[PDB]
Amino acid sequence: LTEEEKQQILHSEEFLSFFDHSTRIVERALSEQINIFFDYSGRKLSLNRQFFDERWSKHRVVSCLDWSSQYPELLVASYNNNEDAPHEPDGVALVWNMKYKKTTPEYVFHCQSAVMSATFAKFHPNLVVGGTYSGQIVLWDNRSNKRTPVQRTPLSAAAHTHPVYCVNVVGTQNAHNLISISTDGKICSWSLDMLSHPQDSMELVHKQSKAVAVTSMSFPVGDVNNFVVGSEEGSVYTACRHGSKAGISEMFEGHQGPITGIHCHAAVGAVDFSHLFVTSSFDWTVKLWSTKNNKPLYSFEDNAGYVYDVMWSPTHPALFACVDGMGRLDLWNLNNDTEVPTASISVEGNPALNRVRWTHSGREIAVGDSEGQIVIYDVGEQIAVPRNDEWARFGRTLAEI
Amino acid sequence: LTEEEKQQILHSEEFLSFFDHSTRIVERALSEQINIKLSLNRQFFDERWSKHRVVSCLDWSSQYPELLVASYNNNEDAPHEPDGVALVWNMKYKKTTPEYVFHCQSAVMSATFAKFHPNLVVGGTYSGQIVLWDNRSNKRTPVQRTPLSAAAHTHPVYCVNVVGTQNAHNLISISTDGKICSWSLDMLSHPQDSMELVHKQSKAVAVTSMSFPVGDVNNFVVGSEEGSVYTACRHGSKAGISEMFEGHQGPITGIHCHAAVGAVDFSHLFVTSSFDWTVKLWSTKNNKPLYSFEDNAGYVYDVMWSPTHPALFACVDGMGRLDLWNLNNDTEVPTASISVEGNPALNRVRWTHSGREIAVGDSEGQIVIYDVGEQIAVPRNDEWARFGRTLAEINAN
Amino acid sequence: ANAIEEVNLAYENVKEVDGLDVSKEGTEAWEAAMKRYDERIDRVETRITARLRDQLGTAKNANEMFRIFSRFNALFVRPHIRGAIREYQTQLIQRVKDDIESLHDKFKVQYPQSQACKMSHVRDLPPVSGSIIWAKQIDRQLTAYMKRVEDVLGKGWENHVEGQKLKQDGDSFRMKL
Amino acid sequence: IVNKAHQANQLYPFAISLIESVRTYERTCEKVEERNTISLLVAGLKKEVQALIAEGIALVWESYKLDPYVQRLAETVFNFQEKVDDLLIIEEK
Amino acid sequence: EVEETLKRLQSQKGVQGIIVVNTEGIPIKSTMDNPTTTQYASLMHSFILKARSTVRDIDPQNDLTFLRIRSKKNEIMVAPDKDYFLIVIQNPT
Amino acid sequence: EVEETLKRLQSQKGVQGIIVVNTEGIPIKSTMDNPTTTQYASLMHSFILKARSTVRDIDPQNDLTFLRIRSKKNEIMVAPDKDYFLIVIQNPT
Known part of the structure; x- marks a missing residue:
C-alpha cells in the first residue's frame, strides 16, 4: 500500500502549489515544438542449388521436368536428344534429391531414344517412366537406378510412335493413369506397371482429320480429366478421358505459337475455383485462362525470348514463374502486381530455362535449363498470403472492357 | 589512448557519418531556450567561406524549402582555400553558421538545386565544369565533375537549370559559346544532348543566367551580348537560337521567366534585368519591348517573379536597392523597395518557391533574405491582363 | 473524374444554346457561342492534361505508358492536349524506334543462332519450321509496335516523322520476315 | 579585336576550354600527381594526357589543330580532374 | 488548477501520456494503467535520482533542474520537484 | 575538419568544452583538463549506459537520440549516437 487517501493531496490547497510549479515547468518545455531537420539523413529469391553434373547431363538439353509427385522434393528431369556419342542414348531421364543436398543425378535412366517426358508412377514410389522421342514410353524402377528400360512400349498406331512430350499421372491408387501424350494426335492412358498395351488410348483430333501434334499439354487439378492440349501452334484444347466427353471438346487461343508452360493450382485460401490455368506460348506470351471462360485475363507477352514454362503452386497461387529464351525467371503475383514481375531474376548467362515448376503445396522452383542443369529456386518472401481473392478481384477488373 | 589509434579512428571511414551527425546534433541543439512593408529578415555571413567572395547565383529549393544555394566566385584572396563555395543555409532553424559547405576545385558559378533530387547540389564553375555535390558525404569536395571536351562545356557555366519531368529529367547547362548541354543527374562523365546555339551573326552568344517558363519547356531566355533575348530550344529543328527579343542596349545579367502561376493568367512574359540600368518587361511572343521600367541607379544584376504574386518582380542594382514592382497598382514606380547596409552591388534576386520571400545576393559574401505577407495571390486575373493591354496600348505613342 | 461533370454541364448548357436548334444564319455568332464552349473544352482539356499526365507519368516505357495511353488515345486526339504532352509522346516514339531496331537485331541473332532452335527441338521444331515462327514472331511484335506508333500519336501519327519512318522500315522488315 | 571577336563568335570553345582547362588542369595536376604512389598509379593515363597536351602545345597555332589542341588539353585536364579527386581522396582519406 | 492544465494538454499535438510522480517513485495521478505510469515513472525516478547523484558527483551543489x-x-520531459518528480511523455513530431 | 568541428561547436556560448567521450570511456575528443574530466567522462558514460537501459527497457523499439x-x-546536454556518444556542457547562457 502506498498511501491511505491518494486524492486528498490532489485536492489539497498547498500541494497543488507544487503541482503549479511542476506544470509551469511543463508549459516551459512544451513551448519548444521544434523537430530535427533531416538534411538528407536517409534514416526475396531464395535461390537454391543447381543439379549440374555432366556425368549424365553432358550437353543434354532438359526436356519437361516433373516434381516429386510421390517423393519428398526428389524431382525428375527428362532429357532431349544429345548426339555427344552416336550409339549412346540421346536423352537420359535423371532424378535428383533436393532433400539430400547434392548435385549428381540420384537415379540415372538411359533408354535407347530421347526421353521427351518423364514422370512418377502415382502411389508407386518405386517407378518412374519416360516418354521417349521415338515413341517408346519406357518404364524404370526409380530407386533401382536401372539404366535400361524395365518395360518398353510397342510402337503401334494405338500406342505412341511419336515423341511423348508429356507423360503424367492423374489420380490416386485407383485412378492412377500413365497418360503419355505425343505428336501422334493421341493420348495413351497406360497402366503404371504394364506398359505393353495402353488402357485408354484415345485420339486428339478436332474436326480436321489431321493428327494434331501436341506441344506441352497439361492435366487439371483434382483429376477431373479435363486435360488441356497445347497443339502444334497454341490452340488450347479442352478434353476429357471417360464417357462421351472423352477427347477433344473445344479450342481457344490468346496466342499463335505453341504452348510452352501450363499447370493448375489448389486452394487460394479456399476462395477461387482453383482451375485458373495460365498458358504460355512460343509467340512470346503468357496468358491466363479458365475452363469456364473461353478468353479471360491478359496475355503477359514475354517478348525478347522463347517462353518455356509457367507454374503457380498453391502456396500463394498468385505466383507464376514465367521465363524466356534469354534466361529471365520472372515469378510474381497478380494480386499485388499488374503485369510487372515482383521477383524477377536474370539467370547466369543466357540459359534456356525449359521448365520452371514451383514445389506444389510449398515453394521451391525446379528449373530445367539449356544443358542438363537443374537450377532450383525459392523465395522466402512470397508467403501464402491469406484472402488471396485479389488475384481474382484484380483479374475481373481486367476482364470488363 | 595513443595518438595512432585515436587519429586512425578519427580519420576512419566510420567517423564520417559520426562527424556529420555530431555536427548536425550539436548545431541542432544550438537554439538557446528560455527558463524564466519590407521586413529585412536575415543576413548570411561565413568567415572562412563568405568574405570578398562575390555571390555567383542563388537558387531556391523546390524540394526541401527554405534552402538556397549561395554559389560563390572565390576571388584571388585565398588560393589555398578550395576555389568556389556553395553554402547551404537554414531559415527554419535560424542559424548563424552555414549548414553544409560545398567547396570545389574552381570558382563555382550559378550553382542551383536539382529537382526531384534530395541530395544533389548542381553547379557550374570557373573551370567550365558543372560540379555536383552530395549532401550524404562529409568531404565537401565534389565527387562528380563535368568534362571539358568539344561536345562538353568550354566557357565557365554561368547558368545550369533542370528541364523535364521524372521521365526525361534534363540538366540543361549553358556556356557563353551557345553550347547548351543536357546532362544526366546521376552520371556526369558524358553529356546527353550537347550542341551550340548557332546564330546568324556572332554564333557564340554570351548567354547570361537564363531560366524557363513554368512547364519546363526546352525554350530558355538567352540574355545575349546586347539584350537580344533568344528564346531557344534544345531538340528538333528549332534547337539552338530560335527567337530574338531585340530593342535593348546591354548585356542581360539576370533573366527569369514566369514563375508558378498564383492567381492570374499564364502570362507568357519574361523580364530582363541588365546593364542597361532599367528593368524591361517582355513577352515570350512580343519581339517589342512591352515595358521598360525606370532607369535605376547602377545596373540591374538580377530579377525574379514571385510564384505567389506572378504580377510583380524583384530587381537589384549597384547601389544596393532591391526593388519589387507590381503593375496592378503601379505604372512607372516600384512597389516596395529596401536597401542593404552600405552600398553593396547586389548580384542576385531569387524569390522562394513558396513566394513572399526574397533572396538577395549581395556584393561579396553575405546573402540577405527578405519576408513579406502583403503581396499575396489576390485573384486579379482580369486586372493583370487589362493592365498588360493598357501597357501595349500606351507604349505605342 | 470531375472533368466529366464539367463536360456534361457546359456541353448541354452551351451546345444547345449556341443557336438552340436554330441555324441558316451567318453561323458566326453561333460559332462564337460554341467558341465559348470551346473555352470550356480547353478548361476541361487542362484538367484532363493534369489527370492524364499523372496517370501517364506513373508509366513511362514504350509499352507500359502505352497501355494507359491506349486506354485514353481518344483523349489524346486534340492538339491542345497532344501538343502539350508531345514531350512524353516523342519519348514514347523514340523508345518504339529503339524497340523496332531491337526487333531488327532479334532477326539478326535469330532463332537458329539462339538456344531456341534446340529448345524448339524439345518440341521438335527445326529451323525450317522454327525460323519461320521467329519471322512471324517478330511480325506479331511489329504489329504491336505499329499500334504503338499509331496510338501514341493518334490520327496525327503521320505527323510524327519518326513513327512514319518506323512504319515504313518495320513493314519492309515484315517483308523480310 | 574585331577579328578576335569574330573568331571567338565562330568557335570560342577552344579558348574557353583552354581557360577552363587551365584552372581545371591546375586542380587536376595537383590532386592527381600529389603523391608518389598516386602519380605512379595514374601514370598510365598521365602519359596519354601529357602526350596529347605536349603535341598540342608543340603544334599550336594551326588552322586545323588549334581547336583540337585546346580540346585535347581540356578533355585531358577534366579527366585528370575527376581522377585527381579520386586519387587525392584515396591518398588523403 | 491542474485539471484545466491536464484537459488543455489532452488535445495537444502528439501527447503520449500526461502523468506525474506522487510518492517518490510511486505515482498517484495516473491517466494510464499500473505499469506505464507507476513502473515507468518509478524507473524514471530512480534513474533521474541517479542522474542527480551523477551531477552531484560532478559538483554536490549542482543538483538537477529539468530533464529532456x-x-x-517519444520525448520524455522530467520536471524534478522537491519530493515527487514529474514525467510527461510527448510525441517527437 | 576535426579542428574545424572543435572550433565551430566550441564557438557557441555556454559550451565549456567539447569533451566527447566514446563508448570505451576514454576521452577521444577533448579540449579541457583531462584528469578532471576523465572521471566525469567515465561517470557520465556509466549513466549514459543507464539512460540506454532506460530507453531500451521502457520501450522495446525505442532508441535514445539526444539527452538534455x-x-x-549548467546544462549538460548529451548527444548519444548508435556507435559512440558525446558530452557537452552548456550553461544557461
Missing part, C-alpha cells in the same frame, strides 16, 4: 529525453518515438 | 540534463549550475 528526446528519442525516435 | 538541465542541472542547477
Whole structure:
C-alpha cells in the first residue's frame, strides 16, 4: 500500500502549489515544438542449388521436368536428344534429391531414344517412366537406378510412335493413369506397371482429320480429366478421358505459337475455383485462362525470348514463374502486381530455362535449363498470403472492357 | 589512448557519418531556450567561406524549402582555400553558421538545386565544369565533375537549370559559346544532348543566367551580348537560337521567366534585368519591348517573379536597392523597395518557391533574405491582363 | 473524374444554346457561342492534361505508358492536349524506334543462332519450321509496335516523322520476315 | 579585336576550354600527381594526357589543330580532374 | 488548477501520456494503467535520482533542474520537484 | 575538419568544452583538463549506459537520440549516437 487517501493531496490547497510549479515547468518545455531537420539523413529469391553434373547431363538439353509427385522434393528431369556419342542414348531421364543436398543425378535412366517426358508412377514410389522421342514410353524402377528400360512400349498406331512430350499421372491408387501424350494426335492412358498395351488410348483430333501434334499439354487439378492440349501452334484444347466427353471438346487461343508452360493450382485460401490455368506460348506470351471462360485475363507477352514454362503452386497461387529464351525467371503475383514481375531474376548467362515448376503445396522452383542443369529456386518472401481473392478481384477488373 | 589509434579512428571511414551527425546534433541543439512593408529578415555571413567572395547565383529549393544555394566566385584572396563555395543555409532553424559547405576545385558559378533530387547540389564553375555535390558525404569536395571536351562545356557555366519531368529529367547547362548541354543527374562523365546555339551573326552568344517558363519547356531566355533575348530550344529543328527579343542596349545579367502561376493568367512574359540600368518587361511572343521600367541607379544584376504574386518582380542594382514592382497598382514606380547596409552591388534576386520571400545576393559574401505577407495571390486575373493591354496600348505613342 | 461533370454541364448548357436548334444564319455568332464552349473544352482539356499526365507519368516505357495511353488515345486526339504532352509522346516514339531496331537485331541473332532452335527441338521444331515462327514472331511484335506508333500519336501519327519512318522500315522488315 | 571577336563568335570553345582547362588542369595536376604512389598509379593515363597536351602545345597555332589542341588539353585536364579527386581522396582519406 | 492544465494538454499535438510522480517513485495521478505510469515513472525516478547523484558527483551543489529525453518515438520531459518528480511523455513530431 | 568541428561547436556560448567521450570511456575528443574530466567522462558514460537501459527497457523499439540534463549550475546536454556518444556542457547562457 502506498498511501491511505491518494486524492486528498490532489485536492489539497498547498500541494497543488507544487503541482503549479511542476506544470509551469511543463508549459516551459512544451513551448519548444521544434523537430530535427533531416538534411538528407536517409534514416526475396531464395535461390537454391543447381543439379549440374555432366556425368549424365553432358550437353543434354532438359526436356519437361516433373516434381516429386510421390517423393519428398526428389524431382525428375527428362532429357532431349544429345548426339555427344552416336550409339549412346540421346536423352537420359535423371532424378535428383533436393532433400539430400547434392548435385549428381540420384537415379540415372538411359533408354535407347530421347526421353521427351518423364514422370512418377502415382502411389508407386518405386517407378518412374519416360516418354521417349521415338515413341517408346519406357518404364524404370526409380530407386533401382536401372539404366535400361524395365518395360518398353510397342510402337503401334494405338500406342505412341511419336515423341511423348508429356507423360503424367492423374489420380490416386485407383485412378492412377500413365497418360503419355505425343505428336501422334493421341493420348495413351497406360497402366503404371504394364506398359505393353495402353488402357485408354484415345485420339486428339478436332474436326480436321489431321493428327494434331501436341506441344506441352497439361492435366487439371483434382483429376477431373479435363486435360488441356497445347497443339502444334497454341490452340488450347479442352478434353476429357471417360464417357462421351472423352477427347477433344473445344479450342481457344490468346496466342499463335505453341504452348510452352501450363499447370493448375489448389486452394487460394479456399476462395477461387482453383482451375485458373495460365498458358504460355512460343509467340512470346503468357496468358491466363479458365475452363469456364473461353478468353479471360491478359496475355503477359514475354517478348525478347522463347517462353518455356509457367507454374503457380498453391502456396500463394498468385505466383507464376514465367521465363524466356534469354534466361529471365520472372515469378510474381497478380494480386499485388499488374503485369510487372515482383521477383524477377536474370539467370547466369543466357540459359534456356525449359521448365520452371514451383514445389506444389510449398515453394521451391525446379528449373530445367539449356544443358542438363537443374537450377532450383525459392523465395522466402512470397508467403501464402491469406484472402488471396485479389488475384481474382484484380483479374475481373481486367476482364470488363 | 595513443595518438595512432585515436587519429586512425578519427580519420576512419566510420567517423564520417559520426562527424556529420555530431555536427548536425550539436548545431541542432544550438537554439538557446528560455527558463524564466519590407521586413529585412536575415543576413548570411561565413568567415572562412563568405568574405570578398562575390555571390555567383542563388537558387531556391523546390524540394526541401527554405534552402538556397549561395554559389560563390572565390576571388584571388585565398588560393589555398578550395576555389568556389556553395553554402547551404537554414531559415527554419535560424542559424548563424552555414549548414553544409560545398567547396570545389574552381570558382563555382550559378550553382542551383536539382529537382526531384534530395541530395544533389548542381553547379557550374570557373573551370567550365558543372560540379555536383552530395549532401550524404562529409568531404565537401565534389565527387562528380563535368568534362571539358568539344561536345562538353568550354566557357565557365554561368547558368545550369533542370528541364523535364521524372521521365526525361534534363540538366540543361549553358556556356557563353551557345553550347547548351543536357546532362544526366546521376552520371556526369558524358553529356546527353550537347550542341551550340548557332546564330546568324556572332554564333557564340554570351548567354547570361537564363531560366524557363513554368512547364519546363526546352525554350530558355538567352540574355545575349546586347539584350537580344533568344528564346531557344534544345531538340528538333528549332534547337539552338530560335527567337530574338531585340530593342535593348546591354548585356542581360539576370533573366527569369514566369514563375508558378498564383492567381492570374499564364502570362507568357519574361523580364530582363541588365546593364542597361532599367528593368524591361517582355513577352515570350512580343519581339517589342512591352515595358521598360525606370532607369535605376547602377545596373540591374538580377530579377525574379514571385510564384505567389506572378504580377510583380524583384530587381537589384549597384547601389544596393532591391526593388519589387507590381503593375496592378503601379505604372512607372516600384512597389516596395529596401536597401542593404552600405552600398553593396547586389548580384542576385531569387524569390522562394513558396513566394513572399526574397533572396538577395549581395556584393561579396553575405546573402540577405527578405519576408513579406502583403503581396499575396489576390485573384486579379482580369486586372493583370487589362493592365498588360493598357501597357501595349500606351507604349505605342 | 470531375472533368466529366464539367463536360456534361457546359456541353448541354452551351451546345444547345449556341443557336438552340436554330441555324441558316451567318453561323458566326453561333460559332462564337460554341467558341465559348470551346473555352470550356480547353478548361476541361487542362484538367484532363493534369489527370492524364499523372496517370501517364506513373508509366513511362514504350509499352507500359502505352497501355494507359491506349486506354485514353481518344483523349489524346486534340492538339491542345497532344501538343502539350508531345514531350512524353516523342519519348514514347523514340523508345518504339529503339524497340523496332531491337526487333531488327532479334532477326539478326535469330532463332537458329539462339538456344531456341534446340529448345524448339524439345518440341521438335527445326529451323525450317522454327525460323519461320521467329519471322512471324517478330511480325506479331511489329504489329504491336505499329499500334504503338499509331496510338501514341493518334490520327496525327503521320505527323510524327519518326513513327512514319518506323512504319515504313518495320513493314519492309515484315517483308523480310 | 574585331577579328578576335569574330573568331571567338565562330568557335570560342577552344579558348574557353583552354581557360577552363587551365584552372581545371591546375586542380587536376595537383590532386592527381600529389603523391608518389598516386602519380605512379595514374601514370598510365598521365602519359596519354601529357602526350596529347605536349603535341598540342608543340603544334599550336594551326588552322586545323588549334581547336583540337585546346580540346585535347581540356578533355585531358577534366579527366585528370575527376581522377585527381579520386586519387587525392584515396591518398588523403 | 491542474485539471484545466491536464484537459488543455489532452488535445495537444502528439501527447503520449500526461502523468506525474506522487510518492517518490510511486505515482498517484495516473491517466494510464499500473505499469506505464507507476513502473515507468518509478524507473524514471530512480534513474533521474541517479542522474542527480551523477551531477552531484560532478559538483554536490549542482543538483538537477529539468530533464529532456528526446528519442525516435517519444520525448520524455522530467520536471524534478522537491519530493515527487514529474514525467510527461510527448510525441517527437 | 576535426579542428574545424572543435572550433565551430566550441564557438557557441555556454559550451565549456567539447569533451566527447566514446563508448570505451576514454576521452577521444577533448579540449579541457583531462584528469578532471576523465572521471566525469567515465561517470557520465556509466549513466549514459543507464539512460540506454532506460530507453531500451521502457520501450522495446525505442532508441535514445539526444539527452538534455538541465542541472542547477549548467546544462549538460548529451548527444548519444548508435556507435559512440558525446558530452557537452552548456550553461544557461
